Structure 1
Amino acid sequence: LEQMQDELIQQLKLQMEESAIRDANNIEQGKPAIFKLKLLPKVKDILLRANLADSILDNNLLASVRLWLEPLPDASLPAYQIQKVLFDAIKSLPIKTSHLRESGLGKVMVFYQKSKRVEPNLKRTAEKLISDWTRPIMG
């Protein structure tokens, strides 16, 4: 049951990493990033399912989430749909300090907060999430 969900989430993790690598190569080959957009619906459907959050945190899928959120070496930001969906998923899940330590998403969150090409709404949401994640450390 839970182990089956963990296996499926690990398969999703492998698919997401492979899609990110393929899109990075395609951009390096002069082609638009399409694989991330293709995989976006399934990732959205999986993330929207609340009962799978525990298995997601068991498999540390936030590492692949950060990998997708990490800007590519061409200094090009990811597609706005991907950013919006990932922000909504991050809001929808109970992220703890241990999960952040495993994933290290705080660095990308700070980068998004400091950046200006990022949408101002995403900027405000990043500030809110960073404050919420700093809340437990100080009390």
Structure 2
Amino acid sequence: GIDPFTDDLEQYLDEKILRLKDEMNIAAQLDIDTLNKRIETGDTSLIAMQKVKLLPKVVSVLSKANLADTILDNNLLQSVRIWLEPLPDGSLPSFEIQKSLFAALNDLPVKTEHLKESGLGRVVIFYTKSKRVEAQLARLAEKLIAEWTRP
């Protein structure tokens, strides 16, 4: 994902975001494995905490305005979409994850092309229908859908 004809700094930022994208994907996949393992085996002690563990790192990157271009250009939002998706048993990620991700989306200059490559629009719509979503986060989702379906 790094651009060969960019200088070291630009490659360094692309790498930072590409590393984060992979770490987010590993964390989501490990939590999914845990929740399938929790189903196949009915072991009730099993909880999915890899996304929650990595969240401060994700929030720190998402909240830096000077990283917006790099975030958007490298499709990090695809990993955000994956973090918001219901899990195999229909359960949502933790409130802290939902709130932190939506608040960060509110500040990013997301364009149609980014929504297209990430699939982020589709998961945000789900948050406006779900019964398990807190009412304040459903309002935030609706407000994002509205900022993204302007004519």
TM range (shorter): over 0.9
Aligned to 1:68: 83
% identical aligned pairs:
60
Aligned to 1:19: 27
Counterpart AA for 2:84: L
Q: For residue 29 of structure 1, give the secondary structure of its aligned residue in structure 2.
A: helix
Matched, 1:3 2:18: no
RMSD: 0.8
Bigger helix share: 1
What is the distance in 2 between the residues matched to 1:46 and 1:102?
A: 20
Gaps of 5+ in 2: 1-8, 39-45
State whether residues 35 and 88 of structure 2, in contact with CA within 8 Å, keep that contact through their aligned partners in structure 1. Answer: no
Aligned to 1:111: 126
Structure 1 or 2, whichever has the larger Rg, is 2
Aligned length: 136
How far does residue 106 in structure 1 lie from its aligned partner after superposition? Answer: 1.1
Aligned to 1:134: 149
Q: For residue 112 of structure 1, give the secondary structure of its aligned residue in structure 2.
A: helix
Counterpart AA for 2:58: V
Gaps of 5+ in 1: none
Q: For residue 72 of structure 1, give the secondary structure of its aligned residue in structure 2.
A: coil
How far does residue 48 in structure 1 lie from its aligned partner after superposition? Answer: 1.1
What is the distance in 1 between the residues matched to 2:94 and 2:115?
A: 23
2:52 alignment partner, one of 28, 37, 61: 37
What is the distance in 1 between the residues matched to 2:122 and 2:17?
A: 24
2:36 alignment partner, one of 28, 32, 36: 28
